[PDB]
Design a binder for this molecule. Structure first.
Ligand SMILES: Cc1cccc(-c2[nH]c(CNc3ccccc3F)nc2-c2ccc3ncnn3c2)n1
Length: 298
């Protein structure tokens, strides 16, 4: 693995470590590199990606975890598939999409989240998994115009037999802008795994809003914005978010334009039904997938 990979170009720094474009036997791969003092972050992400039966077309393709000693210090590596478009955030900043394109991005995202969330029962069993930091910067766009989900480092895994979670969750681990109301106000019951699934759904609703803005019909579309761009600072605090989302009870604005088009009407209805304050009221990822699959056929 690491011995035979050559780093070519720095992509960016995430929560911990740095992502690079590298070449393995001539083929582009992505490499996330951590220092020795970040071993816990590296290990936990490696552990999630090595979950039995995890691989899926809408989850980032994991190749290997490894160590590389350069002669002075040790680097801890994760290696994955490389996607030239990069993140959905980058993609939506650079491009507009068609109705077809929008549905493909939304459906693929929902399909990946439904797979994450779904327990697969059997001898080779997959636990249900919640992401805890879903956002457009953590979703990649493939050449074929579908998405796959990345940064599984903060994920939690469910044991169905006991209704327990594999780690002891801390409060408010993810990106503040995308935190669900119950995460912002700390009312979430973090002994209840379903609560983490429901919080992911709220975040996916925000991502859908980002996509729909860029859906261009007759040359008409909105400019790229992050959710709540109109209400909070860049790099918002929990308190700034809580005042908007919990107290004033605002959600991203749904433009009037989105009523002129069946696909955009279906997307807008999904968003509203991801954004309820009470997590139990929100749609499931499986139900969103079904709705978009049917829309995708019509
Ligand atoms: C497990 C693993 C290995 C290698 C990269 C990633 C990964 N982890 C994130 C998380 N997000 C992220 C990170 C840094 C900076 C900023 C961000 F938003 N992205 C990528 C990724 C993978 C493949 C790819 N191809 C083109 N870019 N690219 C990015 N994971």
């Amino acid at each position: 693995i690491a011995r035979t990979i050559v780093l070519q170009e720095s992509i960016g720094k995430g929560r911990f470590g740095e992502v690079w474009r590298g070449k393995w036997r001539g083929e582009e791969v992505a490499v996330k590199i951590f220092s020795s003092r970040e071993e816990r972050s590296w290990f936990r992400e490696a552990e999630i990606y090595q979950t039995v039966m995890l691989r899926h077309e809408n989850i980032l393709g994991f190749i290997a975890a490894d160590n590389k000693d350069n002669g002075t210090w040790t680097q801890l590596w994760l290696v994955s598939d490389y996607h030239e478009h990069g993140s959905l955030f980058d993609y939506l900043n650079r491009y507009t999409v068609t109705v077809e394109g929008m549905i493909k991005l939304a459906l693929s995202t929902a399909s990946g989240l439904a797979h994450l969330h779904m327990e697969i029962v059997g001898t080779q069993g997959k636990p249900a998994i919640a992401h805890r930091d879903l956002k457009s910067k953590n979703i990649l766009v493939k050449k074929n115009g579908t998405c796959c989900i990345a940064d599984l480092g903060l994920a939690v895994r469910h044991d169905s037999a006991t209704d327990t979670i594999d780690i002891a969750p801390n409060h408010r681990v993810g990106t503040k802008r995308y935190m669900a109301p119950e995460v912002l106000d700390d009312s979430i019951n973090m002994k209840h795994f379903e609560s983490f699934k429901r919080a992911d759904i709220y975040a996916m609703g925000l991502v859908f809003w980002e996509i729909a803005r860029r859906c261009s019909i007759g040359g008409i579309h909105e400019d790229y914005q992050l959710p709540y761009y109109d209400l909070v600072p860049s790099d918002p605090s929990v308190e700034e978010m809580r005042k908007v989302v919990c107290e004033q009870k605002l959600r991203p604005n749904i433009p009037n334009r989105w009523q002129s088009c069946e696909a955009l009407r279906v997307m807008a209805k999904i968003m509203r039904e991801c954004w309820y304050a009470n997590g139990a009221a929100r749609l499931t990822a499986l139900r969103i997938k079904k709705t978009l699959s049917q829309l995708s056929q019509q």
